Each structure stands twice: as structure tokens, then as C-alpha cells.
Design a protein around this ligand. Structure first.
Ligand SMILES: C[C@@H]1O[C@H](O)[C@@H](O)[C@H](O)[C@@H]1O
Lengths: 311, 308
């Protein structure tokens, strides 16, 4: 049986699996009342991708497809419908047992980015354009599981119908009350009033005094006040690593130690659960203040009854 | 001796190490006249990062720093002087043995992206489209400062933390000086670049470089620009982790169809971290994107590759 391992990347060498951002800090929030059930950055310890998780850092909260037409929307700006395909360009098959095309955003909010187009038709070179764009994942028109979504632009005219279109995510447009940013609220992938399907399962601590440990990134804002963050269960590099090592899980829980390679000391220990998330024995909310050269080291397989040293 | 390996990621599971793009195709161009000496996506087979190469996919062609001054363009647009730090926020030390801050773009062109700011003193935020002309005399990242330009005329704040997220190219018109193999002058035009990753080339007759190619978006105009990297970012990350000793100067690798188990072609993976093939034509390699490279054995510079 192939031994389980984690990459030896330090915190400053990791990226978020839920938005294309570096990992900034480790973070806890024991009193979180929301159900934690994100769909990107989901991978079992034996390498099974779940939810909408795919391997490309460039695919996270990305879309590929074609603009169909400008559409009316009550909300501010100029709005456009685009059909979406799989990120590799093949048609998205709604009958596949996934919640939405892989890479689809997994939270409620106004996602800010750039829409770019390279025309199909044509020194036999195609015309191009790109503009800032916003995708409101809470919108009734956000229906990626049905193969189309809507985005809005400040630009009023220069978006072409029927041309190949890419959305590159950059941040959030706003986190004001009317922008409905909630990182733990899933979009309705098939539209308002419809049930999401094929979801990766919720995660939670199952042991007294333990709480989830997140890899947190701060996400840029187009405007307004705020310091929004996106918390992922494991960084994208871990998803990539686990996926290639398909190492058998020898118990439900791995014991991992956060180590300072400079000093050799263990800063704290954590449970790495089979479904792909971490818990720690910590009684507070907020960042874990530790050097970013720290990294998690796999120690051994333990079980649900193992008591973690308090952080 | 730790065995050399490559990740088992397929083409459709790889990303470019020189720009944040997925790999679209493998590609050759035997008649290329330029010296190939890119500085991102550079890593030896035994895990030594070189040039401006760093591990984060988010760091490639990224900048971090603070705006110091607004300067209007003579014709159109607004320019902003920016001091740059290391991507991890620590001050960039120009005496470090690197060409420029890690992640600095490694080619001539107008790089299009978004500048975003989150103030220090809840904080205020703003973002706008921006262009960094890497051929500009004001592009001097090794000296710790660059300039970017905006369509926005006023709403960029001085003395506030600033992030550049690259998206594509502004233009590939003649006056936009896009040339993926022309390095920026990291310290300005009269100064020599330093600490560079070495140039790469075939040393054997009938061989040519094999690239991992991505098509890069354009803000406007005509074109279908591409960026070619020597190895995808996932290979850089893998080699750095493994640090497997290199047992000869050349590894022999096979591009395999996992469905059929058959080898489609073979290539030389050179110690300095680049591929060559025996191919006498230019253009994409037509192969399924579930194909992947598998390490076969160590060979040498005199090994004759099976023609593609
Ligand atoms: C070639 C032209 O480039 C401009 O920048 C674009 O705004 C137009 O849509 C068109 O593609």
C-alpha cells in the first residue's frame, strides 16, 4: 500500500483552491453557524475529486463559452448571456453527475473579472476584445448546470454575439449588503427554486473542542469598503498532489504536524480527515499567527478518538 | 538515489509557467531565429529554480507594491509609477542574485491586467484595468519600480498596497512590441540583465525545441498571440519538491496514450529543464489531451530520438 504524503510546500508556496489567490494565512472560526459545503477544492485523501473541483489553478471560478446576446436585467450595467462549455471546450453534459461545470464558482457573490473574446472568423487573424465584467452567482440567470450564465459590463456595446468567450476571475465587485457575498452559501446551479445535486458533502468537526482549520486568502475588490476573504479546506496544490498519489487511506483520520523547517519545531498538530479537511483543537477565531515558511508534515494514521494537543 | 519522475498530469491538466493560462497544445518551431532564454518556468531536473521563477501560479507576471506618482501620457491615458516589493510583501533587495523580483514578466509586450488596491488605514478598495509595457524605459523591476497605465484617469491611490493581476496582452500591433523571446531590460535599457537562466537550444542535428503553448487573451485589435513555455508550472512544482538527482545530462521521456498504452513519440528532457524532439516542421503536435509524458531512462546528448 502506497504511503500517504503531503507536498512539502510552505504556506507562502500555496494557492487557494476556491479562487485564484495565494494562501495568506491559516484561519479558524469555531462559532461559524453556516454549513460548510464548498464545492471547489474538494478531494479525498485517496485522490477522489468531488463537487466542481478540477486540477487547473486557471480553471477556478473560470468560464469558457460564447456570448449569445445582450439581455435586459433590472440591475445596473449592460448584461450579456453566455452559454458555457466545459473548460476544455467540450460541450457540458448536464446529465453528468456533477453540480455544474468543473471550476464553476461555489459561493454567492458578485464575482469581478475580465471577459475576453477571440473571434472565430477572419493576415487571416481574428478580432479581439476584453472588458471588465461581473457575474452575480446569486442571480436567477446564473444557471451553469443548464449551460448558460449572465454577466454584466460597464462597457455598453463592445461585446460580440456568437464569439468564443473567456471569463478570467479577478476578485469581487462589491461586498455591500445588496451584493450578497456569502462564501458558504452555494449558488443555485440550475437557477432559482431548483435543488443542487451531486454535491461534495458538508464538513464539520466531530470531536469536542475541535474546529475547522482553513487556508485563507484575501480577495480583491473592484470598489467599496471591506476586506473579504475566501477560505478553502485544502490548497489547490494539495488537491493536485492527492489526485496524483492515489494513496489508500489507512484510517479515517491522518495526524499532521505544522512544522517550522528553520527551527524544526512543531508549532501545532491537526487532524486531516479522509474527506479532505483539517480540524484543530483551538478555542478562538482568527488567523493562526505563524511564519509562512511553515508546512504540514504527515505523521501517522490515527483515529477519531485521538486527542489533539491544544493550539 | 531518488528516482527521477514527472507528474502524471495530462495536457488538459497543465498550466503555463510564463503566463496564467492553461496549456492548449504542444508546439514546435524549428526555424525560430531568436535566442530562447525565458526566465519564468525555469527549473533544472534536480529541482533548482532559475531566472525569475517562483512556485505560485498566481505569481506569474504578478506584481505587488505601492503607487507613488500619477503622470499623464502626452497623447492618451494615465500612467502611474509603482514601487514593487517581492510577491510575499518583503522589500525587494536588488543585491539578491536574481534578474528581477520573482514572477516578473519575462517578455517584451503590453501586459494587460487589473490593478487592485486595498487601503491600509473597513478599508477602501478600487480596481481598474491596467497595462504594463515591459519594453518601456520605465519598466525597471530590478531597480524596484515600474509604471503601469490606465484608461481610468484619477481613481488610483498613492501609498496604498497594490496588486497587479495579469489577464492577457493589450495589443499585438507593431507599436506594441510583443515578442515573447525578447527579454525586458530589468534595470533599464543601458544596463545588462543579470543572474539569468541560460539560453536553451537543440545541440543535435534534426532536433528542435518542444514547447507547451498557451493562447493569450487580447484587450483589442487583431491577432492570435501565444506564449510558449519550456515546462508547465506543475512540472516546476514537481521537480522542486522531488529534487531527484540527475543521473545524466539528458532524460529520455515518452509521450504516451494511457488508453492504448502506446508511445506516440519520444523527447529529450534536458538537465536544465527543456524538451527537444526530432521534428522537421512547425506547428502544433496533434495528439489527444489525455496524453502525458513518462520518464523512460537517462540517455546522453548523442542519443538519436525516434523521428516524430
Ligand atoms: C479589432 C477591434 O479591436 C477593438 O479593440 C475592439 O473594441 C473591437 O471590437 C474589434 O475587435
Amino acid at each position: 500500500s502506497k504511503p500517504f504524503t503531503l507536498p512539502i510546500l510552505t504556506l507562502g508556496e500555496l494557492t487557494n483552491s476556491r479562487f485564484p489567490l495565494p494562501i495568506d494565512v491559516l484561519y479558524t472560526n469555531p462559532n461559524e453557524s453556516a454549513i460548510v459545503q464548498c464545492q471547489n477544492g474538494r478531494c479525498t485523501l485517496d485522490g477522489e475529486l468531488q463537487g466542481t473541483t478540477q486540477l487547473l489553478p486557471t480553471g477556478i471560478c473560470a468560464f469558457r463559452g460564447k456570448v449569445t446576446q445582450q439581455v435586459q436585467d433590472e440591475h445596473r450595467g449592460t448584461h450579456w448571456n453566455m452559454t458555457v462549455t466545459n473548460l476544455n471546450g467540450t460541450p457540458f453534459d448536464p446529465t453528468e453527475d456533477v453540480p455544474a461545470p468543473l471550476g464553476t464558482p461555489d459561493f454567492s457573490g458578485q464575482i469581478y473579472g475580465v471577459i475576453s473574446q477571440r473571434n472565430t472568423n477572419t493576415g487571416n487573424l481574428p478580432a479581439n476584445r476584453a472588458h471588465e465584467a461581473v457575474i452575480a452567482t446569486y442571480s436567477p440567470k446564473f444557471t451553469p448546470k443548464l449551460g448558460n450564465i449572465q454577466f454584466s459590463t460597464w462597457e455598453t456595446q463592445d461585446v460580440s454575439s456568437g464569439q468564443p468567450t473567456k471569463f478570467t476571475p479577478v476578485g469581487l465587485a462589491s461586498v455591500d449588503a445588496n451584493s450578497h457575498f456569502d462564501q458558504w452559501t452555494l449558488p443555485s446551479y440550475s437557477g432559482a427554486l431548483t435543488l443542487n445535486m451531486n454535491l461534495a458533502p458538508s464538513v464539520a468537526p466531530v470531536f469536542p473542542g475541535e474546529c475547522l482549520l482553513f487556508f485563507r486568502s484575501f480577495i480583491p475588490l473592484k470598489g467599496g469598503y471591506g476586506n473579504p476573504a475566501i477560505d478553502c479546506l485544502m490548497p489547490q496544490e494539495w488537491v493536485q498532489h492527492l489526485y496524483q498519489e492515489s494513496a489508500p487511506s489507512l484510517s479515517d483520520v491522518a495526524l499532521v504536524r505544522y512544522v517550522n523547517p528553520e527551527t524544526g519545531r512543531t508549532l501545532f498538530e491537526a487532524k486531516l480527515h479522509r474527506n479532505g479537511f483539517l480540524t484543530v483543537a483551538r478555542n478562538s477565531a482568527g488567523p493562526v499567527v505563524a511564519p509562512t515558511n511553515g508546512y504540514f508534515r504527515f505523521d501517522s494514521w490515527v483515529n477519531q478518538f485521538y486527542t489533539l494537543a491544544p493550539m
